[PDB]
């Protein structure tokens, strides 16, 4: 089988009013060969702002995380930035 990694991405909104359900729907609509979306939660970070914390499993040789982050960030209407919360080998 192909080498894989499980990654947890933090996707940050613009403010406390950003439509979070739309934000995660847009992330999950991203389709890449070797990318599998997993569980997610909206986590408070203070002052009423919540970040999206979502898991994904990627085939190392097929999915560029740099590219995935860049793609998510194209949703400028909802996304301010993305960061890797944690990542592990599977």
């Amino acid at each position: 089988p192909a080498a894989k990694s499980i990654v947890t991405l933090d996707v940050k909104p613009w403010d406390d009013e950003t439509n979070l359900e739309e934000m995660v729907a847009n992330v999950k609509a991203i389709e890449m060969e070797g990318l599998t979306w997993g569980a997610h939660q909206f986590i408070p970070i203070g002052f009423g702002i919540k970040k999206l914390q979502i898991n994904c499993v990627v085939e190392d040789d097929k999915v560029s995380l740099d590219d995935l982050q860049q793609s998510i960030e194209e949703d400028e209407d909802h996304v301010q930035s993305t960061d890797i919360a944690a990542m592990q080998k599977l």
């Binding site: 403010d15 970070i45 898991n55 930035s81 990542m87 599977l90």
Partner: protein, 440 residues
């Protein structure tokens, strides 16, 4: 249930080393990650016979469940030892993990190198061009000075003493070339699958007297891998150092105002302090600090905090800027900085003028390799030549960097998290740098 100190550990090794089962075993039996999934499979295991099950079998099913994307827990894994709460990373083989290992949060206090004991697996794992050596080199370069070696798959070589001894000899050579002193490294023979010497001592090796390591105060000994981990030395945290807090994001909240967010890397942030943001040089008072759901009296090294400041627009401070204390070595933008660069394996050569993007703390800025000042022996730091004309894979060199945009960095000796960086090019990290001087 005793109060614990916190440490970070990174587990590295070749694809056949069995390091994921080994790390998985520790988390399973000493932590609480995806326990509902673990429980589902422990019950299901009754189907294999009359009830008995091997932890490795459950780990295998947990892995498949994770691959389906239906497990609940995030990828931040932890487990406990008698003294510590350990945050562990089973290093990914993903190439984008290299940058994350260099600039990500939670740098390791100890690396655990898992070695397959088998005949063709051991050799494959110590190749000079392998991912394992690169990870070991990166850890060494970043200051991870503690190392533990676990020789896995001992069952496959029938727990033969000679084989273990030869592996220890060869692995000592391997790590010495990277830079580690083998005398300070415990070598533990284990079976990640069967559990030998993981949490309990093995009964398959009467010759085994335990592992040992030299420390500054004496010799520490033990039998298991868990004991080796518990023996990791307590590192000193930067609580009393001046505040350094690289910004990750900046929000404009109605009724509150400006709220920068970032990780406290050194020092402590408190409401009432007067802070400065660099490269811009804006100064202001911290109104309140929040983390997760709690309002804080202080955010300490490691806390990812939000804080509210007045008379700073979100337009004047941004991701990459650094927040510090105006009355205790305030951070400053720099005109240039000199750093020791270790060139990783990549399809190219570096000449003065090269200007790739550098990732340092939360900053992402192209910086020119303005001058190649020296080439050095990597392990000792001895100068080999002045003004090398180019750098190739493997070289260690002192380079003068000039940032293309205002940038705040620090010497690694003073503020570690703001003094290490990754150099990006050709879809990979091509070099790692440690800052030695800054022209503020």
């Amino acid at each position: 249930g005793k109060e614990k100190s916190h440490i970070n550990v990174v587990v590295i090794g070749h694809v056949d080393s069995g390091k994921s089962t080994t790390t998985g075993h520790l988390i399973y039996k000493c932590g609480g990650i995806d326990k509902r999934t673990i429980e589902k499979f422990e019950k299901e295991a009754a189907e294999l016979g009359k009830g008995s099950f091997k932890y490795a079998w459950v780990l295998d099913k947990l892995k498949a469940e994770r691959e389906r994307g239906i497990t609940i827990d995030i990828a931040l894994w932890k487990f406990e030892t008698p003294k510590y709460q350990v945050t562990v990373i089973d290093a990914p083989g993903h190439r984008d993990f290299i940058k994350n290992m260099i600039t990500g949060t939670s740098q390791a206090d100890c690396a655990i190198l898992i070695i397959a004991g088998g005949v063709g697996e051991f050799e494959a794992g110590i190749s000079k061009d392998g991912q394992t050596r690169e990870h070991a080199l990166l850890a060494f370069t970043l200051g991870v000075r503690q190392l533990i070696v676990a020789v896995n798959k001992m069952d496959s070589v029938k727990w033969d003493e000679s084989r273990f001894q030869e592996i220890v000899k060869e692995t000592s050579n391997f790590i010495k070339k990277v830079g580690y002193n083998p005398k300070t490294v415990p070598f533990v023979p284990i079976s990640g699958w069967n559990g030998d010497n993981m949490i309990e001592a093995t009964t398959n090796a009467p010759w085994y007297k335990g592992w040992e390591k030299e420390t500054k105060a004496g010799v520490v000994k033990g039998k298991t891998l868990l004991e080796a981990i518990d023996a990791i030395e307590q590192p000193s945290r930067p609580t009393d150092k001046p505040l350094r807090l690289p910004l990750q994001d900046v929000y404009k909240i109605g009724g509150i105002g400006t709220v920068p967010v970032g990780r406290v890397e050194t020092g402590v942030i408190k409401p009432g302090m007067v802070v400065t943001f660099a490269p811009a040089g804006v100064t202001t008072e911290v109104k309140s600090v929040e983390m997760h759901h709690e309002q804080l009296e202080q955010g300490v090294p490691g806390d990812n905090v939000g804080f509210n400041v007045k008379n700073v627009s979100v337009k004047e401070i941004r991701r990459g800027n650094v927040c510090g204390d105006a009355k205790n070595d305030p951070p400053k933008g720099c005109a240039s900085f000199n750093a020791t660069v270790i060139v990783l394996n990549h399809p190219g050569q570096i000449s003065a003028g090269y200007s790739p993007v550098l990732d340092c703390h939360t900053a992402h800025i192209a910086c020119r390799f303005d001058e190649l000042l020296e080439k050095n022996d990597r392990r000792s730091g001895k100068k080999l030549e002045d003004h090398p004309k180019f750098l190739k894979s493997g070289d260690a060199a002192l380079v003068k960097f000039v940032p293309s945009k205002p940038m705040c960095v620090e010497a690694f000796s003073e503020y570690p998290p703001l003094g290490r960086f990754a150099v990006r090019d050709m879809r990979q990290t091509v070099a790692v740098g440690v800052i030695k001087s800054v022209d503020k």
